[PDB]
Amino acid sequence: DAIADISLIEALQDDSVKLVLADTAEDRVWKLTWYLGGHSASLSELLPMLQSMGVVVLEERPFTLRRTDGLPVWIYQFKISPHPSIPHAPDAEAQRDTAQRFADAVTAIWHGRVEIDRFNELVMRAGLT
Amino acid sequence: DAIADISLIEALQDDSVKLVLADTAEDRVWKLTWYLGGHSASLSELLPMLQSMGVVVLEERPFTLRRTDGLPVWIYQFKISPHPSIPHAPDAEAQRDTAQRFADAVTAIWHGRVEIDRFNELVMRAGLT
C-alpha cells in the first residue's frame, strides 16, 4: 500500500486533490481515500459533498505527513455505503466506470464547479457525468 | 483516563448515551467524548446535531469495545471548535455551566425531544437551556 500511496502523494501539487474509490472485502461497503495536497479540510465541509452523492458516511480515519519538499499532505479514509435503492454493478467494467465518475464528480464538487444538491445522486443512478 | 472511562461505561444502560465536554490544551478547541451504550451510530446523523449547536466539527476518532455483561459500547472523540462570534467564558464557572448545558442539550437532541435548527445555538449564545 505504501507504493501506491507515495506515488499518488508525489503526483500531487499545491492545494491539489486526489480520490481513489475501491470496494471493501465485504458487500455494499466502499473505501474512499481522499488526499489533500497542501491544506487541511474539516469534516463539516468534506461530508456534505459526499452526502450529495447519495452515499451514507459511516466511518472516517485521518492521517497526515510531510512530503519530500516539505509540503504537508493529509489523507482521509472514508468507509461509506451507497443507498440501498442504488442499482448494483452488472460487471467489473460498470464498477470501474462508476468509480471514475464518482471521483471526477466529487473532485468537481470540491473545486466549486457545481452545486451541492441531490441531483448529483443521478451520477450513481442513471450513470451520468 | 481508564478510570474515568470505565466508570462512565459501567454507568451506562441499554441504548444509553453519555457526553463529556472538556477543553483542549490549546485555545478555542474542545474535545467531546460521546459514549453510546449498546448501539452504533453513523456520522451522517451524529454530525447534524452538533452542527445545530453552532460548533464546527473538525476531527473524529472512533472506538468500540465490549462491557462486562457482553454489551458492546462505542466511544467517539470529537475535536470541535465553536464559532468565533460566540462569546468566551469570563471564568471557569461559566465554562462548567456551558459544558453542562451543552451536554444536556445534545442529549435531548439525540432522543428526539427537540428539533434540529439554529435556535439551539442560543444555548451557547444567550446561556439558555
UniProtKB/Swiss-Prot annotation, chains A, B:
Q: Which domain of life is it from?
A: Bacteria
What exactly does this protein do? Catalyzes the reversible conversion of L-glutamate to 2-oxoglutarate. Highly specific for NAD.
Stated family: Belongs to the Glu/Leu/Phe/Val dehydrogenases family.
The subunit field of the Swiss-Prot or TrEMBL record says: Interacts with (unphosphorylated) GarA.
Q: What is this protein called?
A: NAD-specific glutamate dehydrogenase
* Gene source species: Mycolicibacterium smegmatis (strain ATCC 700084 / mc(2)155) (Mycobacterium smegmatis)
Instruction: Point out the gene that encodes the protein.
Output: gdh
